[model samples]
Target: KVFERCELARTLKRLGMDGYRGISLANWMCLAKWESGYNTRATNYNAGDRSTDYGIFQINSRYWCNDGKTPGAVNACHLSCSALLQDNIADAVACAKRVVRDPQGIRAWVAWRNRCQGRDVRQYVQGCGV
Candidate 1:
């Protein structure tokens, strides 16, 4: 599912992403824009660490989801990496919530820091009515 910008914004808000863990909805929007471009099945394999990022939030196999192949993976989200690829996004959203509970918070996603941090991210949700 490649969501339209406002569609994803509204969906994320409905999924309780607004101000989740002190991260604004716009920031989440920005993260998704840079991370996966709102595509639910987006993925990126990291050859350096032999891990993979899954879903719109790009949760990693190294620490978040279990892919049965990532060496030393922790499976902190207690979910299979496949779950993150589903079009529903509910599981991905839940796992993302769990991730930010850690010390890094939203900084868990490097894209968030590079593309959203200290930026005027409100444009991501400006016309979304979120």
Candidate 2:
């Protein structure tokens, strides 16, 4: 995962970040894998969900990108752009930072996976060795 890590590092550097200083590479690696599987084209199971969350960051697509436009109009574009480091790793970083800075990034993610995502991906995945 050297090349992949370097790609993410490049993205972080472009955002004026010094890279994961105190963060565990393993943890971050786990996040990247779980979040998008490195596909860079992942999409959240949004739309018609009878709820609020949406987008690639799964960013409550309504709040950040959704501007009350059509159902999948602006939201789709914004979600695509924000998730997977596609057209904007900066945005993805920003969104991820926002989640982390939520005074509970971890907690929020836990809740997101539990309540919204309906599945749990433990940080320590056990048998597979992380």
Candidate 3:
């Protein structure tokens, strides 16, 4: 449950941001910290050697966090259910795993992004998150 300088509540909330809707605030935050580092603006520009990661969760948007589509293109189709998850680490990681089981492998994550465009991790999280 240690991802640098995240709080207990935030950690719990992050951990519960996937699979289950109510995984516990503490657990959720823990997951969040490890995933994105609580820095909403962080981005994983450091790649190739599996370095230079950034974004709140350090997820490479070009691959994992990205919807692989043009701006506002996704919402153009699904209006009623617009996604505010572009930066949501919880949702990003969930979708990212489908790309690579290793989690740290940028290649696998990018592969998944190539297929599933304009989607969020919240789809997988039943009822979880902070």
Candidate 4:
């Protein structure tokens, strides 16, 4: 499902990601926009390495997800690639939280670094009242 921006703001706020505890809600919203256009089922295959990106957050199977095709995958989130295809999104949120705790934090997402960084993303969630 394609989530509207306000829906994401409300969900992020309810999930304590409304800039809570140092997690920037605007950054998350902007990243999601650039990463998947807010489509929960979005997936991208990096043909160069045969690696796949999954979900609205575009969590990579290189470390976060297992599609049974990746060799030596850490599966840090202990989740299947297909789990990320659903619009339910609780699992995606859980996995994303785990990723943020890692060394790269939000930088784990190239889209965030390339597009959402060094910019005032607060406008992403504006008027959402989150």
In model 3, where do residues sit more than 4 Å from their true spots? 1-24, 49-54, 67-130
TM-score of 1: 0.97
Residue 118 CA error for candidate 2 (Å)? 20
**Which residue pairs in model 1 clash with each other?**
none
Which RMSD does model 1 reach against the true structure?
0.7
**Tens-digit lDDT string for candidate 2 (57-92):** 344554345435435534433544335335455566
lDDT (0 to 1) per candidate: 0.92, 0.45, 0.38, 0.86
Which ten-residue region of model 2 has the weakest summed lDDT? 121-130
Taking the tens digit of each residue's C-alpha lDDT, what string does model 1 give over 1-130? Answer: 9999999998999999999999999998999899998998999999999999999998899999999999988898899999999989889999999999999999988889998899998899987888
- Per-residue lDDT for 1-130 in model 3, tens only? 2233434344334544333432333333333445455555544434444333334434443333333432322221221111213434444445433333443433333423443334343432233333
Give the TM-score ranking, best first: 1, 4, 2, 3
Best by TM-score: 1
What are the per-residue Cα lDDT tens digits for candidate 4 across 1-130? 8999999888877876655336788888998899999989999998877779999899899899899886666698999989988988888888888888887888888889899889989799889987
- 1 or 4, which is superior by TM-score? 1
User: Which ten residues in a row are the worst by lDDT in model 1?
Assistant: 121-130
Q: Pick the candidate with the highest lDDT.
A: 1
